[PDB]
Ligand binder design. Structure first.
Ligand SMILES: Nc1ncnc2c1ncn2[C@@H]1O[C@H](COP(=O)(O)OP(=O)(O)CP(=O)(O)O)[C@@H](O)[C@H]1O
Ligand SMILES: [Mg+2]
Lengths: 88, 265
């Protein structure tokens, strides 16, 4: 599971410590994505190294519904996204 | 990229590991010599250590520095895990210290400089090694130090850092005393290392792990008279009970003993 640890009006600290992987299947990096639930600009993204278990998303607009999705990219695999909605 | 056993010519064995063997090997495309460490899943699972292997791969794959052993990649099959590593032709510092029994000041200072550069590079990515010791250091073809074995390393933002890990004679007091630790535990272990290099045994050595813990916790150790003034100062600055009082790696690199004894690039 994905969780929001802490929030400000412009930023979220998220954490995927709960997500588990298959034995011997190791994560190269995470693709982190976020945008305004339903109503449209382009959903934005960035990546962090596979050894991260949390990350900060900054420069969000206050009072907005976000959907945050994380894709664990294995060296040999793609895990199916975990996601969460949060309102700044 | 992806990797499989078919991408390597395999040569002679370089050593016997705990859960496998390491072979000299060559990447067919490039023809590039490297080492291929083979681990048996059966033996890993028996010993309980797969989490350490995950940690090693996920961290060490990202580390690119002249004094850190490259982990180019890994792969696995029904029975084995393979790590594709840089080949260190001059072997372990552990074996060099066994042979020579102690290192002189120049060799010691030069290695402390190399190790400090590498840990500077780790700490900027907020990675801590947590198991600095002579067995985890290897030597390139020009005799240059390479730190390896990131099994017990940790990314600081991604961990609570309240569990003790490492190797007995090298453990910092903070971990023994149960407190939250940070990058300064590497600084402590560097000082133990410098001492062991110069003297040929670690400072808190004792017949049981209990006595050793007490002695670390109380920073109970003495130097032989041969250890010079400058080495003594450097080590004493590294081996402070209070982590916050230990120097930054920058200050270690600028210490006057280090300056006076380290070889020029
Ligand atoms: N990259 C390299 N280049 C050259 N020789 C290497 C090497 N990596 C390992 N060796 C040699 O092979 C031996 C076994 O290495 P290995 O890493 O398997 O040791 P080990 O299993 O005891 C440490 P660990 O507990 O971390 O698995 C080493 O002592 C060394 O002689
Ligand atoms: Mg290892």
């Amino acid at each position: 599971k994905l969780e929001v640890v802490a929030a400000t009006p412009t930023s979220l600290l998220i954490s995927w410590d709960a997500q588990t992987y298959q034995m011997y299947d190791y994560v190269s990096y995470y693709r982190i994505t976020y945008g305004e639930t339903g109503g449209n600009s382009p959903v934005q993204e960035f990546t962090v190294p596979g050894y991260y278990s949390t990350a900060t998303i900054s420069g969000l607009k206050p009072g907005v519904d976000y959907t945050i999705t994380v894709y664990a990219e294995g060296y040999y695999s793609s895990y199916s996204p975990i996601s969460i909605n949060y309102r700044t | 990229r992806q990797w499989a056993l078919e991408d390597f010519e395999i040569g002679r064995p370089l050593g016997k590991g705990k859960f496998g063997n390491v072979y000299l090997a060559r990447e067919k495309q490039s023809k590039f010599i490297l080492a291929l460490k083979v681990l048996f899943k059966a033996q890993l699972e028996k010993a309980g250590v797969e989490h350490q292997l995950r940690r090693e791969v996920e961290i060490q794959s990202h580390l690119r520095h002249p004094n850190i052993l490259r982990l180019y990649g890994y792969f696995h099959d029904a029975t084995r895990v393979y790590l594709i590593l840089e080949y260190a032709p001059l072997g372990t510092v552990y074996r060099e210290l066994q042979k020579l029994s102690k290192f002189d000041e120049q060799r010691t200072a030069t290695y402390i400089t190399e190790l400090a550069n590498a840990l500077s590079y780790c700490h900027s990515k907020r990675v801590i090694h947590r198991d600095i010791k002579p067995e985890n250091l290897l030597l390139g073809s020009a005799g240059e130090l390479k730190i390896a074995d990131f099994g017990w390393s940790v990314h600081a933002p991604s961990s609570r850092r309240t569990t003790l890990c490492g190797t007995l004679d090298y453990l910092p007091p903070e971990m023994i005393e149960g407190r939250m630790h940070d990058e300064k535990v590497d600084l402590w272990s560097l000082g133990v290392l410098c001492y062991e290099f110069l003297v040929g045994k670690p400072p808190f050595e004792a017949n049981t792990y209990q006595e050793t813990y007490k002695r670390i916790s109380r920073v109970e150790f003495t130097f032989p008279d041969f250890v010079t003034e400058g080495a003594r100062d450097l080590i004493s600055r590294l081996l402070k009970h209070n982590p916050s009082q230990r120097p930054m790696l920058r200050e270690v690199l600028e210490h006057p003993w280090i300056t006076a004894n380290s070889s020029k690039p």
